[PDB]
Design a protein around this nucleic acid. Structure first.
Ligand code: K
Ligand code: K
Ligand code: K
Ligand code: MG
Ligand code: MG
Ligand code: MG
Ligand code: MG
Ligand code: MG
Ligand code: MG
Lengths: 170, 94, 306, 121, 173
RNA sequence: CAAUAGUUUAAAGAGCAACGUUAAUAAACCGGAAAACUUUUAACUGCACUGUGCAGUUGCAGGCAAAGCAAUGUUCAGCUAAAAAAA
């Protein structure tokens, strides 16, 4: 006439860290953000756990991307050669050469800007997500010196000595 | 101040302070200090300081309201505070 | 609020006994039904139950065609059936679902009493879904998980929006305002006229004016379910969802879908029976070309040549 | 994103140098971008094919405002330019000094895709 | 806890412009070091508590860079000398929480709330603060957990000169 | 509000915004009163609280760390300190 409820088991015996995906230098967490509130040793706010859940998902996608691609650690002021696929033109491959004028390090949303000048048409700027699958390879080919952001902006407005390659290859 | 003064009056008359109830309270007009303050474009206004009288009457076993307030102790400061002796080793167990 | 209570009178001794006998007879109920969990056929007019979820935030991903897709993440912590309604006692059939978890000493005794009586955890939110027939009722305690949905279907989301505070007409209703120069005097952001003259002589109800903005119930229809993660009770939905982080969101099969579409999806009915732990992560497949306009003329072009 | 009554530079060899937008076609909204056809008035021309004061049709080829692609990227130019067109839909010149973008891969712009010097695709 | 605002740094505005705001907070921070106990309004006390904690952190650093930052905050040479010498050694093992705040009701004239701000380890302290390093029972779950997660847990105060420095000096001499 | 553009130096992967993103062409959508039903010893402040509390005592947007900086880790601060002995 007595019904005993079921007690859940522990996943990792005598291990105090669940082993969630995090960056190498970050101290390890002690819980899984997707665990139900009822089964937690510490009852932390749902709102704070949801922020941590998104961070875990972002790191999982970044790990998969790094296994697929290996790009160099370029900086602002370097000349780059970028291989891209044009989905509009039946997914054809082209190689672009230009100067890197802005770089944002924001995890999976990282991006950079490429600048180039043509013989007659003038300047041309592109904004490229770094983790976009359309990009196939990136290489460093040179460097252009500048003093500060103001000097770099003046160079961009006054198109000059940025005509590395006149046209796109392939 | 009025409440304390009235209770002292009741004790002199031989009433029990533990059964006193505030049965009547009202105000009365005093003598006013008149004044004037200038305004724009040559107009003028009033500047009055008011005064009032206060009367309190305390009676025994009069009809009273049931309101009662909860009381708590203030912050413990000094040798009477022992929050530093808490043992925090228990919260690491299941 | 409510109106003042109406007066009551004792019944005459020649009628009191009769009234009590009849009232008691009407208030006598039979045994509670015992639902059974078993797959059922889907009919042209048959509605399923929804679920209660928590909004987590937004992210993005690239699909098989290389297109960037904005996503909103919804988490299902614990959703269970906590009560039933049936015709004999209430006049209609419905299923009550609860979600969340709270501590006993943080809620009123009235709320905690219902859950303790049936050996269920005290849940933070409760919502009712109406069913079509008694056979659609689910046994109390059944779990509603992420497996309840089929990847690639359309869903509806409801919730309370973000609070904005006291806002003016320009931000609240999009009024144009008045010029910044040319003699304007202290009326740059004001609503202007609010009526006429002696006729009609009043201001109409629901005339748009300043006030509080941002905490109201809204529903978005026809969102696409992109990815499903049954093991971790996660749903990825394309588009925007009302409310800030942590808001409670109700998810339902969209009413924009026809019966044929529901048959093709083969939606679980009354719900998924099994263990969702041993299920993989699935992503919907779109048999469409987002770059077709570059090979064929399908775009909008108003000019006809010659 | 060019509002009405904007000035454009001509990048063809028909003789026109400066034009002003004076109308739109269809329902494009409050602004127009690359790939749309507008009605323009010639303000400065040095040639016999066209003269100042005439009204012609033109197509937007370059703009300074971001142009977004489905993959999340975008690009920008440093000028706003156009190419004059005839009533039959053909260019009034035979040489275009501009960088052609993906908008003109469509079948209806075959003639432009032939006379243009540099192409991004 | 101290509320966080939307301005740069999340500080209070103290009903002042930024220039006057920084001049006021620097002066009060100097007086807190000199006297170790001050009574003021609630808003100035909340801002001073968070600012005071970050000033002690600079003193504990004991570096040329840290001293330069502090030299622009403290107004008196005597107060700056005390910060790096006396207070630096006092809070070697305490990890944060060097200042406490206790509310003390309302004033008389304008009925503004008030509070008392004080340092948390000294003679004359309002209360007795918990030890900087928490002792760990020898047969507790807490001891086992710390071993598995942080093998470098500190259980007792450490000497001014660690054994490695002492050994080096002995070998040298 | 993931990304893109603008905006704040006690700064920033903050917040708010559109020039940005998603959805709608319906017996759909939204508001207040209320029958009935259910629960209760018939309920009733508060986290600096003139943003939000979907946070009430291993609770927390404070402090502190090698950390993505309203997240992870944490021995300190404040509100609110705990235990029969033995078998
Ligand atoms: K009306
Ligand atoms: K959303
Ligand atoms: K600091
Ligand atoms: Mg005068
Ligand atoms: Mg205006
Ligand atoms: Mg005037
Ligand atoms: Mg004005
Ligand atoms: Mg926001
Ligand atoms: Mg902090």
């Amino acid at each position: 006439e007595v019904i005993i409820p079921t007690i859940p088991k522990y996943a990792n015996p005598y291990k105090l860290t669940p082993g969630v995906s995090q960056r190498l230098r970050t101290p390890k967490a002690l819980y899984e953000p997707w665990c139900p509130s009822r089964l937690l040793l510490k009852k932390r706010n749902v709102r704070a756990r949801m922020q941590f859940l998104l961070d875990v998902l972002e790191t999982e996608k970044e790990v998969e991307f790094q296994k697929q691609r290996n790009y160099p650690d370029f900086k602002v002021g370097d000349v780059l050669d970028v291989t891209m696929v044009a989905a509009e033109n039946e997914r054809k491959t082209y190689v672009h050469r230009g100067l890197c004028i802005q770089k944002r390090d924001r995890g999976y949303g990282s991006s950079f800007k490429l600048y180039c000048v043509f013989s007659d048409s003038g300047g041309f700027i592109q904004h490229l997500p770094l983790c976009m699958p359309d990009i196939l390879d990136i290489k460093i080919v040179g460097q252009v010196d500048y003093k500060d952001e103001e000097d770099l902006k003046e160079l961009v407005e006054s198109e000059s000595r940025e005509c590395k390659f006149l046209d796109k290859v392939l | 101040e009025g409440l304390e003064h009235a209770r002292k009056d009741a004790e002199e008359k031989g009433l029990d302070p533990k059964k006193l109830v505030v049965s009547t309270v009202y105000t009365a007009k005093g003598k006013y200090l008149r004044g004037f303050q200038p305004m724009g474009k040559g107009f003028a206004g009033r500047k009055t300081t008011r005064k009032t009288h206060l009367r309190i009457v305390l009676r025994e076993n009069a009809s009273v309201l049931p309101f009662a307030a909860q009381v708590v102790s203030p912050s413990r400061v000094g040798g009477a505070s022992q929050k530093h002796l808490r043992d925090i080793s228990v919260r690491y167990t299941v | 609020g409510y109106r003042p209570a109406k007066p009551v009178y004792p019944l005459p001794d020649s009628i009191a006994s009769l009234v009590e006998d009849k009232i008691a007879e009407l208030k006598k109920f039979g045994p509670t039904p015992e639902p059974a969990l078993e797959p059922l056929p889907l009919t042209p007019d048959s509605v399923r139950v929804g679920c209660i979820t928590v909004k987590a935030g937004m992210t993005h991903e690239w699909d098989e065609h290389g297109v960037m897709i904005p996503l909103t993440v919804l988490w299902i912590d614990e959703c269970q059936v906590v009560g039933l309604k049936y015709f004999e006692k209430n006049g209609y059939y419905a299923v009550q679902l609860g979600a969340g978890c709270v501590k006993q000493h943080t809620v009123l005794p009235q709320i905690a009493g219902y859950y303790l009586k049936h050996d269920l955890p005290i849940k933070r939110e409760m919502k009712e879904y109406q069913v079509s027939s008694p056979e659609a009722l689910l046994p109390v305690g059944t779990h509603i998980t992420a497996a309840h949905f089929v990847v690639g279907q359309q869903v509806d989301v409801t919730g309370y929006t973000t609070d904005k505070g006291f806002q003016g007409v320009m931000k609240r209703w999009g009024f144009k305002g008045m010029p910044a120069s040319h003699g304007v005097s202290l009326s740059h952001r004001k609503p202007g006229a609010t009526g006429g003259r002696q006729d009609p002589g009043k201001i109409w109800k629901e005339k748009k004016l300043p006030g509080h903005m941002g905490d109201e119930k809204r529903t978005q229809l026809g969102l696409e379910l992109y990815k499903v993660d049954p093991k971790r009770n996660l749903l990825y939905v394309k588009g925007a969802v009302p409310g800030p982080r942590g808001a409670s969101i109700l998810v339902r099969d969209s009413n924009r879908m026809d019966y044929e579409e529901r048959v093709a999806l083969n939606l679980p009915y009354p719900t998924f029976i099994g263990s969702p732990d041993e299920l993989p992560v699935l992503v919907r497949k779109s048999d469409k070309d987002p770059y077709l306009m570059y090979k064929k003329e399908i775009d909008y072009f108003p000019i006809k040549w010659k | 994103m060019l509002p009405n009554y904007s000035f454009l530079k001509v990048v063809d060899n028909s003789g026109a140098k400066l034009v002003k937008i004076i109308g739109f076609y269809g329902h494009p909204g409050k602004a127009v971008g690359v790939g749309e056809v507008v009605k323009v008035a010639i303000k400065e021309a040095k040639g016999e094919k066209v003269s100042a004061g005439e009204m012609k049709k033109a197509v937007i080829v370059e703009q300074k405002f971001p142009v977004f692609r489905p993959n999340g990227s975008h690009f920008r130019h440093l000028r706003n330019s156009c190419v004059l067109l005839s009533e039959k839909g053909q260019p009034l010149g035979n040489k275009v000094r501009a960088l052609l973008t993906y908008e003109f891969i469509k079948p209806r712009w075959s003639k432009l895709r032939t006379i243009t010097t540099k192409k991004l695709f | 806890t101290v509320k966080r605002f939307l301005r740069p740094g999340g500080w209070n505005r103290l009903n002042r412009p930024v220039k006057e705001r920084l001049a006021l907070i620097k002066n009060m921070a100097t007086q807190l070091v000199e006297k170790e106990r001050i009574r003021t309004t609630l808003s100035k006390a909340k801002n001073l508590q968070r600012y005071g904690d970050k000033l002690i952190t600079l003193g504990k650093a004991g570096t040329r860079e840290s001293w330069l930052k502090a030299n622009d905050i403290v107004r008196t040479d005597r107060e700056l000398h005390k910060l790096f010498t006396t207070l630096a050694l006092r809070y070697k093992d305490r990890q944060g929480g060097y200042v406490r705040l206790i509310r003390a009701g309302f004033r008389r004239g304008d009925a503004a709330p008030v509070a008392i701000v004080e340092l948390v380890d000294r003679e004359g302290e309002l209360r007795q603060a918990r030890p900087a390093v928490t002792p760990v029972p020898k047969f507790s779950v807490m001891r086992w957990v710390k071993q598995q997660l942080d093998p470098k847990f500190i259980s007792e105060p450490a000497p001014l000169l660690p054994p490695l420095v002492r050994d080096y000096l002995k070998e040298q001499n």
